[PDB]
Amino acid sequence: QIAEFKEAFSLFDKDGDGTITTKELGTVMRSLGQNPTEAELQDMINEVDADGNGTIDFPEFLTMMARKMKDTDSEEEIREAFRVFDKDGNGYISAAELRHVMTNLGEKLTDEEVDEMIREADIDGDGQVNYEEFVQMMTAK
Amino acid sequence: AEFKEAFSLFDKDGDGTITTKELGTVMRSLGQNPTEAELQDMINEVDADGNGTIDFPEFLTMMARKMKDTDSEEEIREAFRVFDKDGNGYISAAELRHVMTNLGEKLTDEEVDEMIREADIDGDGQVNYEEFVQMMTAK
């Protein structure tokens, strides 16, 4: 709980001012455990207090988490998913496909996000990824 | 209505190409409601004769060549019959299944059985086809 989250906050305070930039709200939620939308963050970054704020303290954030807890908890439920990219049912997809799914589809990610992600993803010498293992690793927590 | 993002949802191999047989679903994922016939005519008027897959450039050229016929397939908003001549506003479930599964580019019975789930049927055995056409499109 709060002891590791406070250390996570103290690694997001860089300056040491007790407060972190309001822009880094989504990354701090993600660091603790959650997986919220950038929209969901916008819908709860707004306030009259934190909308006006340039930086947020750990008491403020703890208050925001308490208010939005149910919605915030809802974004750790998923553990299963389906894709495609394999039609033949190999169970494997290329790194090229995975990049195309992530950067051209849905809520498009950047290449730098995908490159950051393939530092914690098993990739064989062929250049393919077992997507059943990959879904287990990304939900692993 | 070209969309590279939509192509990339159908390129599932990052290969750059999609199977020629997924051309009708890609048009109907973009927008466009083409017939299966119009789709075959569009493929057949290119020497894509031996082509197993299509790239986004090829698909772009076909939509530009046939833009007028394809655009016509998102003008419509209402749909009359030519069943019903009495003008009762009703059609039997038997006629409705026959027009769907026997005429034209035939739906399967399983697709028709899906469409008539929840659809009210009177004691004559007839369905309000105006409500039925609104329910299948407005959703």
Add this chain to the structure above:
Amino acid sequence: AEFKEAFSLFDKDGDGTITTKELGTVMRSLGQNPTEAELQDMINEVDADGNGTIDFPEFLTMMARKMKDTDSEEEIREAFRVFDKDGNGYISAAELRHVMTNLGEKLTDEEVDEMIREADIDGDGQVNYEEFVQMMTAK
């Protein structure tokens, strides 16, 4: 924590100045614990740009300017990881050497080989890192 007597043990010659590269060792002689990075930042935020040596007044002004960051380095008494996640309480000598010689402000292999003298190693090849951190500091 300024100490003129400690400065007079770094000054050996009695010139009144010590080399700007002995700044980290003088801070650490005193009681402080600054990173090699923090030591460079402290020098770089003064136009001691061309300065080959520092006097005791200059060193005093730098410690007073940076008292808060420098004091922080003598708060800590315990040390966690983040290497272990299983919570076995054990880390391989390979991972211990890697964190020491490959991450951060790298130790030499000869420095690490000194600290693993008299350090027990099991048949898995792992060392109790709690005992190892205590044995290094509590001496």
Add this chain to the structure above:
Amino acid sequence: YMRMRRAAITIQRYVRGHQARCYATFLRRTRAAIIIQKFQRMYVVRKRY
């Protein structure tokens, strides 16, 4: 289509959580190395003097 884009969007959220946590774990590993290297260098100089 509007259902299957909602498998891509959800995974895109979970990956954004995964990367941030991984980035944080790596920073904690580098920070843990710097502090201990530092404790050693403060201690090693003081012993000798």
